[PDB]
Amino acid sequence: VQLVESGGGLVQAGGSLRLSCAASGSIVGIHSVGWYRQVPGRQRELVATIVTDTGTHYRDFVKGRFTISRDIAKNTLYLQMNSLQPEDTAVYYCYFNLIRGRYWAQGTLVTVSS
Amino acid sequence: QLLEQSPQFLSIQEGENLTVYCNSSSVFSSLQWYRQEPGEGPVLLVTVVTGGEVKKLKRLTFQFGDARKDSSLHITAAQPGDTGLYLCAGAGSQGNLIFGKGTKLSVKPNIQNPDPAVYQLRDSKSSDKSVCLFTDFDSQTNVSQSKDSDVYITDKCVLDMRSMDFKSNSAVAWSNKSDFACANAFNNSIIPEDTFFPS
Amino acid sequence: DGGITQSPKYLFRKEGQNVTLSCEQNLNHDAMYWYRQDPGQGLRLIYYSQIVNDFQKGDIAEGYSVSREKKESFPLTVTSAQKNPTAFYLCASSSRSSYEQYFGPGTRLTVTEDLKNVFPPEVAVFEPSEAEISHTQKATLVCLATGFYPDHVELSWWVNGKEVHSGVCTDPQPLKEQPALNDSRYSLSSRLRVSATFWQNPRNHFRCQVQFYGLSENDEWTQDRAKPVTQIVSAEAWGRAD
Amino acid sequence: DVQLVESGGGVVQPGGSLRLSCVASGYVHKINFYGWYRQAPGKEREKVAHISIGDQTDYADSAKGRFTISRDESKNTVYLQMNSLRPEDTAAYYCRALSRIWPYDYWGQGTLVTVSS
Numbered sequence: 001v002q003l004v005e006s007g008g009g010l011v012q013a014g015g016s017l018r019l020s021c022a023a024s025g026s027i028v029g030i031h032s033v034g035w036y037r038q039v040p041g042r043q044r045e046l047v048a049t050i051v052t053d054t055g056t057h058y059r060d061f062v063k064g065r066f067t068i069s070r071d072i073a074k075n076t077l078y079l080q081m082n083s084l085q086p087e088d089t090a091v092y093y094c095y096f097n098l099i100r101g102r103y104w105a106q107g108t109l110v111t112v113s114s
Numbered sequence: 115q116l117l118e119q120s121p122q123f124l125s126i127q128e129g130e131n132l133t134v135y136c137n138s139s140s141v142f143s144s145l146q147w148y149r150q151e152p153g154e155g156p157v158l159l160v161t162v163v164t165g166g167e168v169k170k171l172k173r174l175t176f177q178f179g180d181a182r183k184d185s186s187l188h189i190t191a192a193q194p195g196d197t198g199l200y201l202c203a204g205a206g207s208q209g210n211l212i213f214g215k216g217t218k219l220s221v222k223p224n225i226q227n228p229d230p231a232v233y234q235l236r237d238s239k240s241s242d243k244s245v246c247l248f249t250d251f252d253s254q255t256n257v258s259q260s261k262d263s264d265v266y267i268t269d270k271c272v273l274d275m276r277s278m279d280f281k282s283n284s285a286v287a288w289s290n291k292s293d294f295a296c297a298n299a300f301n302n303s304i305i306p307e308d309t310f311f312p313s
Numbered sequence: 314d315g316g317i318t319q320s321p322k323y324l325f326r327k328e329g330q331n332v333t334l335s336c337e338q339n340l341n342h343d344a345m346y347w348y349r350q351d352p353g354q355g356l357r358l359i360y361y362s363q364i365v366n367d368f369q370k371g372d373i374a375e376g377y378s379v380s381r382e383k384k385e386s387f388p389l390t391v392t393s394a395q396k397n398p399t400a401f402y403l404c405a406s407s408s409r410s411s412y413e414q415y416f417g418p419g420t421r422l423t424v425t426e427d428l429k430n431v432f433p434p435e436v437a438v439f440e441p442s443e444a445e446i447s448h449t450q451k452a453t454l455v456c457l458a459t460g461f462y463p464d465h466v467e468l469s470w471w472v473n474g475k476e477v478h479s480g481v482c483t484d485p486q487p488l489k490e491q492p493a494l495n496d497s498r499y500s501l502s503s504r505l506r507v508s509a510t511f512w513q514n515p516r517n518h519f520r521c522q523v524q525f526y527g528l529s530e531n532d533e534w535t536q537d538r539a540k541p542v543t544q545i546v547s548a549e550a551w552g553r554a555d
Numbered sequence: 556d557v558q559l560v561e562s563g564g565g566v567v568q569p570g571g572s573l574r575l576s577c578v579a580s581g582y583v584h585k586i587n588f589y590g591w592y593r594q595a596p597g598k599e600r601e602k603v604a605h606i607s608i609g610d611q612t613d614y615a616d617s618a619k620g621r622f623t624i625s626r627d628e629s630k631n632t633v634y635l636q637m638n639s640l641r642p643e644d645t646a647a648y649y650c651r652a653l654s655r656i657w658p659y660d661y662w663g664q665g666t667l668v669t670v671s672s
């Protein structure tokens with residue numbers, strides 16, 4: 001059901017943010033809840049994800065480094081970002097994939113400066 | 115007298131720009147260009163004549179060399195329809211046209227809202243092959259062939275299921291009965307780690 | 314391309330049978346040219362004929378003949394057991410004053426070594442996943458046309474009996490199963506996904522026919538199951554609810 | 556589409572060992588099975604051997620049990636580990652890469668192996 005992202009903003013490289021994401025609707029759908037990200041003049045690509053059948057999985061180079069997690073209520077979902085590089089600057093999205101399709105969030109803009 | 119057209123292949127995503135280029139040593143009068151989508155033959159795209167000339171004919175903009183040496187065919191914002199094998203040509207060595215090897219463009223679509231899943235399809239008729247669908251995922255997933263020889267998996271097509279303006283990558287694999295289930299169909303591909311396999 | 318016609322669209326024969334591929338053009342143009350374009354390559358020009366009774370060789374051309382008489386007809390003919398011609402046969406005319414060539418719609422020819430090996434395709438319509446129906450709310454039937462050789466089939470799909478081209482994706486080219494062989498038999502799949510709302514409506518007959526182009530009459534046929542004439546084959550299902 | 560530059564090759568005195576690498580680039584999630592052929596001054600392409608992805612391995616009359624083909628998913632180099640020569644065997648060895656989606660074949664530049672006594 002409808003996701004409401006929060007918690008974007010600018011940092012300087014080296015930075016710390018944490019992107020966060022409220023929810024409504026099925027916590028007895030789930031299936032996986034991942035961030036992905038929208039690098040302008042790119043499409044989307046996966047950054048984080050936590051599956052219910054498998055652990056958490058990462059990818060992009062934004063391994064060793066940010067961390068996905070999510071709460072006992074499954075009413076919130078957060079994406080730490082640690083050691084930002086300016087490479088990262090982008091609209092991150094989040095999706096929570098259930099049984100009755102994926103829903104997505106509006107996104108929130110991150111800036112990651114030189 | 116040969117034109118070499120380079121790239122040999124290009125991919126690029128929907129809406130981005132690209133460019134191909136076609137070059138030779140020796141000028142030609144004319145240079146012409148054709149898009150040829152498989153089992154229809156090469157449809158003339160435009161014919162350029164004069165030096166540095168540029169036509170634009172829609173998305174395509176095409177530009178001939180100043181000493182008429184090579185020509186470039188840029189398209190601005192590719193679209194699925196822009197898919198196909200772009201061959202250059204030119205005047206022969208008595209009149210017989212001389213083709214470049216021709217750049218296979220492949221534009222892939224911008225799936226936004228990717229939701230990769232494989233699901234199993236199946237019938238209540240007779241056929242004894244049960245084929246599982248891997249769909250909607252994103253256009254950078256490359257769906258590898260199996261190392262069972264009684265899968266078979268298909269290659270990504272995109273669909274254009276207009277009027278919702280949804281385009282959607284697919285492949286199907288099946289394997290000969292074997293006694294195979296879904297999961298393991300695409301155990302050899304690197305698939306997304308959010309692919310919803312269903313119970 | 315132009316207003317040039319060549320037919321028939323496909324043609325088949327056993328090896329060591331001659332056949333003529335016809336081209337005629339209604340626009341007046343003077344140089345005529347025919348193309349084999351082998352899979353996933355470029356074109357070779359076999360023979361052109363600039364104007365009439367003049368004909369001169371192309372890049373390839375050993376092993377066929379075309380005679381010219383008329384400016385409105387061009388016969389390509391193949392003289393068998395050559396280097397195993399089969400490729401996609403494409404004719405082109407121009408009016409020689411700049412050389413800008415238009416071309417045919419084209420002729421696939423397949424020559425088989427044997428002739429037993431030919432069969433027409435089964436096919437099946439695989440009715441959609443109740444999972445993909447719940448989670449995407451579209452609904453993909455796949456029609457699986459398997460089995461058949463040669464690769465000349467034209468699969469279209471016809472739902473409530475009028476043919477659609479909307480969200481149908483047919484593998485463009487067919488999967489050669491057993492590639493390492495020649496005379497392997499092929500399958501092609503094609504998808505038609507309509508909305509979910511539509512496969513749930515038990516009224517609709519999709520169905521998915523596939524032309525099959527195939528054995529003439531006066532080949533021989535001694536084996537023991539149907540003899541595989543061009544024929545159509547379908548499969549078909551209803552939508553069903555849920 | 557994919558494109559497989561072969562690797563390695565020249566000149567070798569009888570019973571010697573050569574190791575054709577084929578280095579497969581490109582999309583090569585396609586490719587069914589890979590193989591080596593060879594095609595000599597005089598002849599049409601004889602198949603040599605094959606390996607499919609997932610790892611078996613036929614072969615093919617010629618040198619059956621004495622070339623061993625192998626292959627390394629890591630580098631997508633497929634190797635032809637031709638531990639045994641005789642002059643019979645000088646042929647342009649080309650690697651092949653055969654997919655049931657289309658076009659069914661690619662093929663690659665080629666290499667000479669040449670065996671001189």
Ligand SMILES: *[C@@H]1O[C@H](CO)[C@@H](O[C@@H]2O[C@H](CO)[C@@H](O[C@@H]3O[C@H](CO)[C@@H](O)[C@H](O)[C@@H]3O)[C@H](O)[C@H]2NC(C)=O)[C@H](O)[C@H]1NC(C)=O
Pocket residue numbers: 130131188190
């Ligand atoms: C992809 O390649 C094309 C053409 O090779 C690039 O197009 C050219 O880019 C410049 C800068 O945007 C354009 O200049 C603009 O011109 C007008 C004056 O006519 C003005 O109002 C603007 O403020 C700006 O200075 C030029 O016209 C343009 N040509 C085209 C085809 O639009 C292009 O930017 C690349 N496009 C994308 C979307 O990637």
Ligand SMILES: *[C@@H]1O[C@H](CO[C@@H]2O[C@@H](C)[C@@H](O)[C@@H](O)[C@@H]2O)[C@@H](O[C@@H]2O[C@H](CO)[C@@H](O)[C@H](O)[C@H]2NC(C)=O)[C@H](O)[C@H]1NC(C)=O
Pocket residue numbers: 254255256304581582583584
């Ligand atoms: C999927 O693959 C493409 C193409 O890569 C090649 O074939 C693959 C099946 C696999 O064997 C690759 O390792 C091969 O190189 C990947 O695109 C590559 O991506 C990197 C990083 O962005 C880039 O530097 C390369 O040049 C790419 N090659 C091309 C032709 O684009 C693609 O990103 C893969 N996607 C995934 C997620 O696997």
Ligand SMILES: *[C@@H]1O[C@H](CO)[C@@H](O[C@@H]2O[C@H](CO)[C@@H](O)[C@H](O)[C@H]2NC(C)=O)[C@H](O)[C@H]1NC(C)=O
Pocket residue numbers: 329330331392
């Ligand atoms: C089709 O044409 C080919 C080539 O013209 C035929 O082979 C020739 O037949 C003639 C007439 O009998 C001989 O004199 C030639 O020596 C043959 N030429 C070659 C290249 O073999 C072939 O017989 C014809 N086939 C059929 C089925 O009609």
